[PDB]
Design a protein around this nucleic acid. Structure first.
Lengths: 127, 64, 81, 127, 84, 65, 127, 127
DNA sequence: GGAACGTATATACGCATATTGACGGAG
DNA sequence: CTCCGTCAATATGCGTATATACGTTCC
């Protein structure tokens, strides 16, 4: 199983050719954190203009990418991350997302692997 | 629908099966997709292919 | 085995419980303890892993303290009588 | 049922007397957003001289106060919020929290009520 | 509930359905629909009402030390992501 | 026999009763003493009284200090 | 119920009248920690003289008093004592015993109450 | 089955390579004494830095190694120790752990086996 | 008479957990 | 013809409801 960073997901809904080919090459379930969904959901209304087209693109992404809820198990993983690596205010959100990947034993796929190499036990895939 | 459990594999008539406790169970008439990657089974209600997502996205307009 | 495999199916009842059937190329094998974790749409199932594996998992993946503690001794006090 | 704001819940964990006097007065269930749990768990270790005392004061709380998992309903409510009020990177965490009070039709307890006046349909208790 | 703070009884267990059980005479009984915590260590079984109320939480909190100050909540937790 | 459990009182015809899970249970032919202090109930297999314990300690010499 | 401090147990085994007269007058359950039993068991052989007498008298005590075994619930309480009060090498043993009183909601009976006033929720009986 | 000396478990908790590498060769059940658990819980909070690790590292150990409760059988074994080797105040902790190893018919794993050569019938592994 | 109440047998449901037999397709 | 995926049934352990009635002892 794979969990896409928010940034990787943003490139997928943007049909970015570089990411989209690497996604279709991946054999295995392709999962999405609900934290990322909340970020995506806000980006739909960032501008007045082409919302609804951003909304139309996000909806087809949700129909195909199953969403992991953020629950007690992931919040246990988050606490364990703060215990080993220390607390980092800037990395709270990304640590919530990785915590879910830990909880479900999934490789975490990201453009920013250096920000996660302090999370013990996280399988990483840098792009 | 947010719980953990432990369990053992078991035999149900010539095929392996795993019980789903009530808090982790899906419906009775719910189609599931099951994907193993190593020893990590991922199960979820069936959704539709990755290509169809990529196909559908590129047939829609991108913004900017 | 192959590293990846995929199937589709629905659930059945196997007693008084729900269950899902694992085909040959998804099954974990007989008498393997499992951890099941469900989070909305997704149920992830994987083997419990509690031998040592402790030493690996995550102990050597986790930072270690600066030094090893020196065990405190002499805990049992003198008591009159 | 009440959902405690994270600041209310930090104050309870840290033993502020004004918060502990008022909390007891509340009827029915008292709940925490899981987003609040994550914030609360990171604070535990921020100041190493108080870690142990905060680890056990927070642990005592989580043995009593149910923690709401962040689910599709809360996410739908989060989308409802941004659609009505507009996107705001700063307000995401508080709106996620509020989105759970909404999803459970709970009343949201906070001192900083002016921060939640743009959230349509929230039941607010201003302290 | 209960005229006296202490009260004592003796007897054996009995089976009720498929579990084992102990009868509680009136001067030993908890109430009706009272959720119990049970702990057994060696010879001793202790049974007492569970505490799950905010009055209980607050009472457990107040008997513990306080940290020296109250935490300034960190805000701005979310980063900008390039792209909407 | 070192376990914890939760449970609820129930009515077993005209007298209250409490269920004891397997790991917490005593036998079926053991005599127990049940002492309530406040709302804490303390159960254990019946032995001598405290008074008879002191009576027995009294028929033996006391340690020299 | 009542858990007896080891020193109280020692005076009881030794039939100190001021202690045997008070113990009889308690109307709750009288409980002996397996830690105290390990101390007493070693005390049988502290000196050479009267070992059989200390053996004998400890026997008739252990034949009557129920023994709390030191188990996971007690260690849980021990950890919380350490968290609220700070570590102390000197008080570890007394805290394991007090931890058992906490676990069974028993009043702790001691000649040394001042030493246990840093254990939250412990109820004391000072003799 | 194997019961670890408290020092082995402290070095396991604190990431000692000499002990982490040696423990993986151990076949069968690896067990901890509840007493050893108490000593480990106390250590977690002695240095306030390092407290968040250690807390995290001890937790992971306790999710995997069964902890043995100290009960009447273990106390009978300690009585037999003390009858055969005499009382010794400073050896009480170590003899409680060995007593549990004796009671469960487990081999005691230590790199101070000369401290334990006076316990009869104790199966030793000397690192 | 009959409350109150301690004692003694039932018959049940929920749900995890066993185990075993038969039909039928695709290697 | 055999794997081995899909039907099945059925049993037991055990916590958890609930009933009925045959007692005493004290108005």
């Amino acid at each position: 199983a794979y969990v896409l960073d928010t940034n990787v997901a943003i490139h997928l809904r943007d049909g970015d050719p570089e990411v989209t080919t690497r996604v279709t090459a991946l054999n295995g379930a392709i999962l999405l954190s609900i934290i990322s969904r909340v970020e995506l959901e806000g980006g739909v209304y960032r501008e007045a203009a082409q919302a609804g087209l951003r909304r139309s693109r996000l909806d087809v992404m949700l129909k195909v990418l199953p969403v992991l809820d953020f629950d007690g198990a992931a919040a246990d993983e988050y606490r364990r991350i703060v215990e080993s690596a220390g607390y980092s205010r800037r990395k709270v959100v990304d640590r919530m997302i990785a915590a879910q990947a830990l909880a479900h034993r999934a490789t975490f796929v990201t453009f920013n692997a250096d920000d996660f190499r302090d999370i013990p036990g996280l399988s990483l895939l840098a792009w | 629908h947010h719980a953990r459990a432990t369990g053992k594999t078991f035999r149900s008539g010539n095929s392996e099966a795993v019980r789903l406790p009530r808090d982790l169970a899906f419906g009775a008439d719910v189609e599931l997709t099951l994907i193993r990657s190593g020893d990590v089974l991922t199960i979820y209600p069936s959704k539709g292919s990755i290509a169809d997502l990529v196909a559908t996205l590129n047939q829609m307009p991108r913004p900017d």
